[PDB]
Amino acid sequence: GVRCSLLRLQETLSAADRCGAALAGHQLIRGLGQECVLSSSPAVLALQTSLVFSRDFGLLVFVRKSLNSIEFRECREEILKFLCIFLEKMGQKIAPYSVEIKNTCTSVYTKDRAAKCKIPALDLLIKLLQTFRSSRLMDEFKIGELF
Amino acid sequence: QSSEYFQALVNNMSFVRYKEVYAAAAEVLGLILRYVMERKNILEESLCELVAKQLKQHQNTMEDKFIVCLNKVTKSFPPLADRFMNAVFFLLPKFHGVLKTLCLEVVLCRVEGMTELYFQLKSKDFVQVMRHRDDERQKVCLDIIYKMMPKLKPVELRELLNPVVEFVSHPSTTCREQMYNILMWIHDNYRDPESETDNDSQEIFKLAKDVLIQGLIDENPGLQLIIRNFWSHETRLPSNTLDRLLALNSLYSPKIEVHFLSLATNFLLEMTSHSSLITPLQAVAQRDPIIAKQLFSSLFSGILKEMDKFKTLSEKNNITQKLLQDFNRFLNTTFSFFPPFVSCIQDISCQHAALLSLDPAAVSAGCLASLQQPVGIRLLEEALLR
Amino acid sequence: KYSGRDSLIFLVDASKAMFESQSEDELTPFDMSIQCIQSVYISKIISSDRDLLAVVFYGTEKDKNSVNFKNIYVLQELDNPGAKRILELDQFKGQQGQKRFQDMMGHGSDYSLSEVLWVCANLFSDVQFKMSHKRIMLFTNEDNPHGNDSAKASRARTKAGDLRDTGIFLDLMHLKKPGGFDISLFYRDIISSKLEDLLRKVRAKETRKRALSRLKLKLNKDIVISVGIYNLVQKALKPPPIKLYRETNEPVKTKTRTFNTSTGGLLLPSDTKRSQIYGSRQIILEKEETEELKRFDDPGLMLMGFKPLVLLKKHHYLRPSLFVYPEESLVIGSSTLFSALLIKCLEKEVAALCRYTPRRNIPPYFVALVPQEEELDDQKIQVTPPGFQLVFLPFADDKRKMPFTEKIMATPEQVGKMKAIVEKLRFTYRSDSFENPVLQQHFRNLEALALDLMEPEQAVDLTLPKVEAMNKRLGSLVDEFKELVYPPDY
DNA sequence: AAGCAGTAGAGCATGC
DNA sequence: GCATGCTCTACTGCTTCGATATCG
């Protein structure tokens, strides 16, 4: 039933009235958090993690877009503290979608101002690097620049 | 003296400190107000205005406990909204949580003694607070709509039956019970005995026909039994023998065809009155579709053979032309193809010598993706003969 | 409420007659109303720039609102004052502005009723902040909009009763159709002319009420009284100079560091110490020791006995005097002792001496606490605060000394001539009104690039004296007042 | 200084 | 008698604005 609210959230933001987009985004992200964790059939869980992860549309590009604002704080905060329950509904099968989340959280930290949302970016990075241990999967992340 | 007792009570109500004390204060204040309302002798017109001045002193400096206390007081006393109706309608917007539920539960008890009600609630973007997934708000708003409907004009009633019949994906049997009660009102009272006064007063009749049929596949028993006992009444489907069959096509609505055969024999057999054998047939019918197909396809030919005495020759052409038209309509309007139904219409049409000329452009298009080809071939060959 | 705000709906009449020139050739009341609106926004853009404003025209042909009733059209939503909103409101002047209003809406209809009060109420019923004042300054002229039917007037006064139920206060600005009090019609069971004040007495001010400190005073060691220490001469100046990136109109938000021990890299603030240097010897400290040596007492006030009001000369001061007052927030019931001590200080003229440490870590300063009592009359003339005032005293190196070796006499003839001069130049000093030259020319200079009218309006100086108006007030006694007993004559 | 929210040590009702 | 379902209000912490010591 999803991707309706995804494209609704994607398209409702471009115009004015930047409190209406906030309340609609709160309602629809609550809808996604209700209607994606409830499902349990594993191929359909793969369908959901292939539905919310697209290179053109989705949550990563939607949180990439409206960061040059101040009104999209509650929805972005709900997204960034929802992804640390989505990294624990699933596991190391997300590993070919990892470096984009790392760059997302890194720019969201070094770009924003308020620590109502700056800390959960470090929460996602401190969950992710705790998970994906010292292996081949530590050579993508340039630790020599992160340090 | 009586003039210090209740003053101490209401001054304690002014102690805005604890969830127990002022809530219990407002509750028993409502109770004593109700008993002196029935006991109309004296001592009302002091403490009414005493709690009213306490509330007016309460309102400007605090609002949360004001609306909680007013809700608690009008939980058992009606007419203490008349001093605050513009107040509650004023600060109804821009509350959330349980408090908006408190405001709407206040205003439920005063939508009878009001004039010019709809403009305010339409100004309060009511179509946004009928679209939030809390349950008590969505029950109480339908409960006020069941009271604020029968004073309205159709040019806004058509605006009101646009977001309330998106509740056919709803839990909570009482919420859908209210929803299938307001529509049961609206179809009962917009029957238009040749009125035809509008397009909208014939638009909401159609979009109220659309749900009072589609709610016969409810994922709950009993709630279906309500609607079935309503449909088996007078002035819905008449009850001689044939008129129920003659009207029974028009409640088709291809959201339901899966159940339609079992429903047809169910309504057909409801008007029944060496007895014990007919009721197991309706027991077996609604799980095995095949014997439902055979039961309908035998009742049909039995009626249409025993009507050569009654409803004679000049009526037969009218009835056969309408049934031919209606079978055309069935096959043209179905979207989900059902094999022990498609075979049912093409196995009753291939017997009577007036319906053989059914629909040669649509019968093949049905039976090519219904995968019931050896009755369509038989139908076209028997029509190609004679 | 402290961070609470005040709204303002400006309702403008345009049906038939206010657009008329009154068969005159001076000015129309419509453009007079637009003068008043643009002046109050050009004032509150820098005076009180967080109030909530709105402007609504009623009676016209079109209608755009959120409820869709006739003859009601708004242009602004309840918001902060926006310079773009006043650069679109300034175009409605002159004949071409009147033409612009006429070709974007026109005017004239069977105009509004109770429903314009309804759209004011639903304009108020939507904004989620805190409200303290809610005033409607209506701009209309006529005195019977119910000139044909009584149900209009009955429902209008009932609707005004329901708006005064929640208490929304409206008080119009009546235009000058007779120039004053003649048309005293029945517009009196709604409400409970003067426009030059709104035109120019609001130039540049600020409004705030905080507390600045909440301390305690100790008499012996165990008499604790909770006081608040307010400031009443704020010593204001200009808002801060933000830095801006050149082309894309953005801030910079620069950074800073310290490194380079001739090796490169980066050094943290953990390895940093402080030092002082005398010639060769350098005394080294840590920053904890540097902030430690300015520690002498706790935060508070300390009583040190009393004094009579005769020795503390008004020659002595070093600080803008503060004001102190007791509050019943920390220590319960200390205003009782404060009221008693106030009564006996005003009955026995005595004033206290104390030792002051305001913040949590500061060297002390000796203060003196002086009593003070209110003044009042029937017009709520509250002009002086009841409480104590804090005069600040110097200690050791402040009072320097002059060479002191000068003394000559004079002769008593010039006293009466100087009395004549001071009585020629006599005036009661003030009650207000000595506004700031630099700040006034700065805010008008900012206004010139804000609204781009033409140019900097030359803000008139007021600190200079009127030299001719004291020349002619004096007369020709100047030369005798020079050389009556002291001729220079080179 | 005002104020604004949200965590969280701290208890009650319940299961194995 | 030990490990969970369920409320709970005081504590603390960040933001907003305003005021004061500081090197130049």
Short mmCIF file of N, CA and C in Angstrom, two decimals, chain B residues 56 59-61 63 83-84 86-87 89-91 93-96 115-116 119-120 123-124, chain C residues 1 66-67 69 115 118 121-122 124-128 130 134 155 161-163 165-166 168:
data_model
loop_
_atom_site.label_atom_id
_atom_site.label_comp_id
_atom_site.label_asym_id
_atom_site.label_seq_id
_atom_site.Cartn_x
_atom_site.Cartn_y
_atom_site.Cartn_z
N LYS B 56 -15.09 31.85 34.59
CA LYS B 56 -14.70 33.04 33.84
C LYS B 56 -13.38 33.58 34.36
N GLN B 59 -10.75 31.19 32.95
CA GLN B 59 -10.56 30.98 31.51
C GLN B 59 -9.35 31.71 30.98
N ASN B 60 -9.21 32.98 31.34
CA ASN B 60 -8.20 33.83 30.71
C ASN B 60 -6.80 33.45 31.17
N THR B 61 -6.65 33.09 32.44
CA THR B 61 -5.34 32.75 32.98
C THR B 61 -4.97 31.29 32.80
N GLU B 63 -6.29 27.55 30.55
CA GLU B 63 -7.18 27.03 29.53
C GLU B 63 -7.31 25.51 29.55
N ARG B 83 -23.36 29.44 27.93
CA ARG B 83 -22.54 30.59 28.28
C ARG B 83 -21.15 30.52 27.68
N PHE B 84 -20.81 29.43 26.98
CA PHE B 84 -19.45 29.29 26.49
C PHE B 84 -19.37 28.76 25.06
N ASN B 86 -19.44 30.27 22.00
CA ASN B 86 -18.44 30.97 21.23
C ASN B 86 -17.04 30.77 21.80
N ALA B 87 -16.95 30.45 23.09
CA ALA B 87 -15.65 30.15 23.68
C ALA B 87 -15.12 28.81 23.20
N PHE B 89 -16.15 27.03 20.52
CA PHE B 89 -15.91 27.09 19.09
C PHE B 89 -14.70 27.96 18.77
N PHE B 90 -14.38 28.93 19.64
CA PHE B 90 -13.20 29.75 19.40
C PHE B 90 -11.94 28.94 19.62
N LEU B 91 -11.74 28.45 20.83
CA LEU B 91 -10.54 27.63 21.03
C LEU B 91 -10.86 26.15 20.91
N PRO B 93 -9.88 25.19 17.43
CA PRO B 93 -8.66 24.97 16.65
C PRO B 93 -7.41 25.01 17.49
N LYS B 94 -6.38 24.36 16.95
CA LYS B 94 -5.01 24.39 17.45
C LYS B 94 -4.89 23.84 18.86
N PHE B 95 -5.75 22.88 19.17
CA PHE B 95 -5.52 21.87 20.18
C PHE B 95 -5.41 20.49 19.55
N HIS B 96 -4.68 19.62 20.23
CA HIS B 96 -4.45 18.26 19.76
C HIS B 96 -4.56 17.35 20.97
N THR B 115 -28.60 27.06 16.18
CA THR B 115 -28.94 27.55 14.86
C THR B 115 -27.67 27.93 14.11
N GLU B 116 -27.64 27.64 12.80
CA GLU B 116 -26.56 28.00 11.88
C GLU B 116 -25.23 27.42 12.34
N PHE B 119 -21.45 26.40 9.28
CA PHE B 119 -20.46 27.36 8.80
C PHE B 119 -19.21 27.36 9.67
N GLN B 120 -19.41 27.24 10.98
CA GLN B 120 -18.28 27.26 11.90
C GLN B 120 -17.43 26.02 11.74
N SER B 123 -15.53 26.05 8.73
CA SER B 123 -14.39 26.93 8.89
C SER B 123 -13.28 26.31 9.72
N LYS B 124 -13.59 25.29 10.52
CA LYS B 124 -12.60 24.68 11.40
C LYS B 124 -11.86 23.52 10.75
N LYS C 1 2.57 37.54 30.78
CA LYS C 1 3.45 36.63 30.07
C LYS C 1 4.66 37.40 29.55
N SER C 66 -10.47 32.45 3.74
CA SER C 66 -10.51 31.02 4.01
C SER C 66 -11.91 30.50 4.31
N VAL C 67 -12.94 31.33 4.13
CA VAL C 67 -14.29 30.92 4.48
C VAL C 67 -15.24 31.20 3.32
N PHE C 69 -16.85 34.18 1.98
CA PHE C 69 -18.01 35.05 2.07
C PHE C 69 -17.76 36.30 1.23
N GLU C 115 -20.39 39.59 9.30
CA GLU C 115 -19.45 38.63 8.73
C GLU C 115 -18.02 39.15 8.67
N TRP C 118 -16.83 38.29 11.87
CA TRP C 118 -16.63 36.85 11.85
C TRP C 118 -15.28 36.48 11.26
N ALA C 121 -12.61 37.24 13.73
CA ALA C 121 -12.54 36.23 14.78
C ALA C 121 -11.85 34.96 14.30
N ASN C 122 -12.19 34.50 13.09
CA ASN C 122 -11.50 33.34 12.55
C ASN C 122 -10.09 33.66 12.07
N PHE C 124 -8.26 35.44 14.18
CA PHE C 124 -7.62 35.31 15.49
C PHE C 124 -7.56 33.86 15.96
N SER C 125 -8.51 33.02 15.54
CA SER C 125 -8.68 31.66 16.04
C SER C 125 -7.74 30.64 15.40
N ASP C 126 -6.59 31.05 14.88
CA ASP C 126 -5.81 30.12 14.08
C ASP C 126 -4.33 30.14 14.44
N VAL C 127 -3.82 31.27 14.88
CA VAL C 127 -2.38 31.42 15.09
C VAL C 127 -2.02 30.88 16.46
N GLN C 128 -1.06 29.97 16.50
CA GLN C 128 -0.70 29.25 17.72
C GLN C 128 0.55 29.87 18.33
N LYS C 130 1.14 32.80 22.02
CA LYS C 130 0.44 33.36 23.15
C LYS C 130 0.00 34.78 22.83
N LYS C 134 -5.45 42.19 21.87
CA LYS C 134 -6.12 41.86 20.62
C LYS C 134 -7.02 43.03 20.22
N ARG C 155 -28.35 41.57 14.69
CA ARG C 155 -27.34 40.53 14.63
C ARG C 155 -25.93 41.09 14.71
N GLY C 161 -21.53 41.33 20.96
CA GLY C 161 -21.61 40.74 22.28
C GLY C 161 -20.87 39.42 22.38
N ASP C 162 -20.99 38.58 21.35
CA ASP C 162 -20.25 37.33 21.35
C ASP C 162 -18.75 37.51 21.12
N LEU C 163 -18.33 38.62 20.52
CA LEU C 163 -16.90 38.88 20.42
C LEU C 163 -16.35 39.48 21.70
N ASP C 165 -17.57 38.48 24.47
CA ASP C 165 -17.56 37.31 25.34
C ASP C 165 -16.13 36.82 25.57
N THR C 166 -15.40 36.56 24.49
CA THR C 166 -13.97 36.30 24.64
C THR C 166 -13.15 37.57 24.77
N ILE C 168 -12.46 40.62 22.49
CA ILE C 168 -11.59 41.18 21.46
C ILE C 168 -11.90 42.66 21.36
#
